[PDB]
Subunit: 328 residues, 4 copies
Amino acid sequence: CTGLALETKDGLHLFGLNMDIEYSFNQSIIFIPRNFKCVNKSNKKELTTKYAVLGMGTIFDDYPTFADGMNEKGLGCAGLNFPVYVSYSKEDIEGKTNIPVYNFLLWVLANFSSVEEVKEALKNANIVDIPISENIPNTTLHWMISDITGKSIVVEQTKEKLNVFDNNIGVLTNSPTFDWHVANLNQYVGLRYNQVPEFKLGDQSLTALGQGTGLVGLPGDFTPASRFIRVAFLRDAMIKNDKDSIDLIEFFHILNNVAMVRGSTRTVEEKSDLTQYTSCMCLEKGIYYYNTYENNQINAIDMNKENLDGNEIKTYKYNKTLSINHVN
Amino acid sequence: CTGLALETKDGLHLFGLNMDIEYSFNQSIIFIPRNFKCVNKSNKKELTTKYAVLGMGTIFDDYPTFADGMNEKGLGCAGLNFPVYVSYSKEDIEGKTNIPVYNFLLWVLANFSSVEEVKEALKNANIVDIPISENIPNTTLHWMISDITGKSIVVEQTKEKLNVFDNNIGVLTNSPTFDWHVANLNQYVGLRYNQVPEFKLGDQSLTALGQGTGLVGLPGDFTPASRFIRVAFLRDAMIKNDKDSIDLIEFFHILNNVAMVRGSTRTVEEKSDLTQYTSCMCLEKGIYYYNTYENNQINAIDMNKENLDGNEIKTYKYNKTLSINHVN
Amino acid sequence: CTGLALETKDGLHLFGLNMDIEYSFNQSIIFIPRNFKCVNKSNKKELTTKYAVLGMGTIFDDYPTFADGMNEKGLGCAGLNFPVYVSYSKEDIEGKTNIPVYNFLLWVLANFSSVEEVKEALKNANIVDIPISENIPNTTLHWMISDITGKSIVVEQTKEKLNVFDNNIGVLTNSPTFDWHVANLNQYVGLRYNQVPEFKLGDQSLTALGQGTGLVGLPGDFTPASRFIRVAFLRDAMIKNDKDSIDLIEFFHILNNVAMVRGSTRTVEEKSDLTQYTSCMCLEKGIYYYNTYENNQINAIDMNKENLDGNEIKTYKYNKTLSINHVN
Amino acid sequence: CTGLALETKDGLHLFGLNMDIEYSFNQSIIFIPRNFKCVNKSNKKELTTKYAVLGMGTIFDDYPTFADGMNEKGLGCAGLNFPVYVSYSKEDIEGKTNIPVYNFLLWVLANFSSVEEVKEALKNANIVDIPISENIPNTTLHWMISDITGKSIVVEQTKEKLNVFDNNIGVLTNSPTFDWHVANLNQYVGLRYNQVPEFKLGDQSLTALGQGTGLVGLPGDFTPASRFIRVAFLRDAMIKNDKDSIDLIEFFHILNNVAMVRGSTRTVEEKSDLTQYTSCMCLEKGIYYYNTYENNQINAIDMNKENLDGNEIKTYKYNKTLSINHVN
């Protein structure tokens, strides 16, 4: 997966991700009104939302769980794969706020209005490997959290501790740890967005064959480290050169560059890993935008079109039917 | 620019390109019925279409010129930038079929029903640097031509001759010459679409950090050579692994990977080179599909919805208004 | 700099480095007998060697300091540049063994017979930024230590603590931290030492143009991370495929691949960074082998040809005069 | 193989190559006086030298054949592998100067005093696939020829014709064709020899981790194309920055960077491809310098120490015994 935070020319804050996986997880878009009692029938535990929530997820026995989402206050959160380097506790740790892996997304969005509130709450938190149901194990995750201040954080639990990083890059992918990727960025200080039209190689004149010679050296594969580098620099270039032009579609242009394509990222089980969907949350507006591998048209669900004091969880069907404008 | 030919699971042939440029060229989609007299008011020359034509282009003084297009017989043609290595004659060459650069697209689509017909006609052809108007110079181009047989050719005029290559790769970009790119493909025989999960480095166990380790080495920049490699291999992987799943959207997924993003491909004049539009012609069906940098929704113009024996050139406005599905 | 540990076919252990710098540091090879009182006239501190020492260094006011060296017990140590991530204490830390940066090399070799002894001693150690003379500041260093057991460690002081890593890779370069490079190795699990002679790209047959197609993707520049990857894999390939052939010259073949070449690694002060010298210590034999940028012939200083109970420090002039065998 | 031509600070011209192969070819250094009748006992053909010759080769039934060599006039020639793209005639072509593949080296050095003379002679030449003995087939070769003027040419026979290229790069490797590599150089116009110390990534400061950030993007593998790029740029940097320092050892520093290392370039027959030897001919002086994988000390054979009007071919044994300077 690849997460991205981007500010538009109008001062609006976009946040979302490419969700890159080789299967459907039975997903739908899910809306939860404020003051709603989410009931986990498995362990008879409950969570009452303080804030209305909207995001992509799945419902297990009437209990909502999210992959990524936002709330009415303009807080966004997304979970991304984090293999090898993650470490969850086997059981609750006495004295800590213990949050089961699958519930972390909802725990953030239901409870807190800002990155600052989340940061404070995470100081004494611990992520625990208790699953939603014993036959549905948790996956290995880390999270990116972002809000209307334009600040983002990265949350990674290692065996050492629950790390909370300020994210000044605007991006997240997968393993290794976040500090590893930040240090990796230093390898690419030689990249240039500006054309290099020629090079005098002594008695041989060299000429650029086309645009783009300044970025030769940028990695083109789909591994987490390469995707991180590409999005970090594509984002930086757009902000440097085109701050006053940034709008919703630009978010998709950036992520499309690191989206997986059917056939070329094959798992050991011979399945194609794809960018299943790409979400873009407009935090100020409470609009969850998304498209899918099958249907590239952007769909918009606006939580403000719902009754935020409603008494039902609402869902919207994941759109996988290509939407074409028939001009004539 | 990046051209692509791809066959769908239903045996339909798609052909089109990313048109990558730093400006608008006043483009519209243009339809010309069959038996239509295209009149060039500049030199009082004419061309009467044998076949109905549909494509992207511009009209100068009522005379249509195309960047890319198709005809009613399922023949497609696209022009792509070809700097440095191109050579056009300064004037007509006695004994040859002389075709002005700007008119080549229309000359192909108006006259011929197939790649095979085109190939024969090009044996004695010469591309001449006579412009549409003395103040509108020609640009440096090469062309990809493809039809319902699934065969594609590449047309490149050098100082040596007018080269016509069989294109077994399914792709075209820009300079160097086509044979150069074909030889460049050999550098990448070590690429693997299948995950490499681990490597035993003597006393150190190495583990894949995420999917995609088989393609490490794929170039990630936006130069013509790198784009050619990426599309060639993305296309090959999809055909190898997912032949029976290939549909219209897959064409866009492939090209999106090599699409330029605002800000990061800056010209010496400090303009951003972008993928302005992406066309996809369904050759059997006479449908010209396209989207744009501004509006990613696919738009469809179907020439068969027109009177092919009509008496007017028809145009359709280039769509740059983002089209969103408002779900709720 | 690039450090390397390698075992020969005869079970001998080689350890040394490319010393990559843009200037001379007034170096000579320095031999110190055992039970010798090294006197620092600056601070009137002393160090009496337990073991005889041989290595490359410089003498300040009769006090020896080393860049790299070995002792009579078969322990080797080398210091390599470690900018940005290093942190030394400003003064002694109460309760710790405090070792001034410049003295660390000698402190290791003078005192300890093995990696195991060193590891124990470092548990309560701290590296302090006290210079040899107030006008000769310390440099930013980390160290590799290795012995006749074939075990190697890496010593890095950060602001967090004095880290001691087991080094199962057999190599060290410069920043980032050692764990960063170990994680970076995972990016390259797709590398193959075995030729890939062909690739069937659908209707296009691709053929290897020469040997080496399996390693396409290996980085070719001279940065610390790239040098680390190259040496790690060159070393691994040689052990995997040619364990029973490894001899002294192989050590130089590996390091030559990452050696800097005059002209192409230019500093901001417009000086060429070069591999000034390459050392190779045969730990069991007490032989310090080295060559230089100017003279590539390997020179051997054997500490066992000296009186290990001698009463003088001895030096040997750094050889920069190309040595040619005139055959006829 | 990798060929290199380089001029020293004293205006002397060096020319030679890394000979990269997975086996011994029974080589020795061979000297032939002038006016010497070389007799091929196989076909009873002869060649009388006009000029004295010195180089690496093998003698079949008293007939000398060379891999690389020089003559008394300061002309040098080397043969390098050229698979796939080479085409030799099956028999003599009427009206041409027909030169058997294996004899080309000697034909150049025995007959001609300069590149200019060679160029003229090649206008009507054809390389023929007639072997030295029916059980010793020719190999696929192209050649680099260079002289005391500092001019170099590349000779490649394709099915189209015998191509003679001016070589303004100073280097040669293997396939593809020479013009292909020249065009490939254009991909690397973005390389910089000068350090890039930092990059401001918006709210993240990026810092160079070590020297060499300007060359990130340089390919590090051992394929012909990658070796060509590396040597071309290493050579260019040294001439640009250090023209007045270039001496004999610099030639070896450049080639060492592209030398194959045992274990990591494995053939399909599971043999290690190595840089067997590296030659460096000082053209003005008639000195053939070389070292080997086993013995890195440079050995010098000076043809001017021989009687150039002698009556015997003379040989010198290929030195594979590591030569060490025992300092103490």
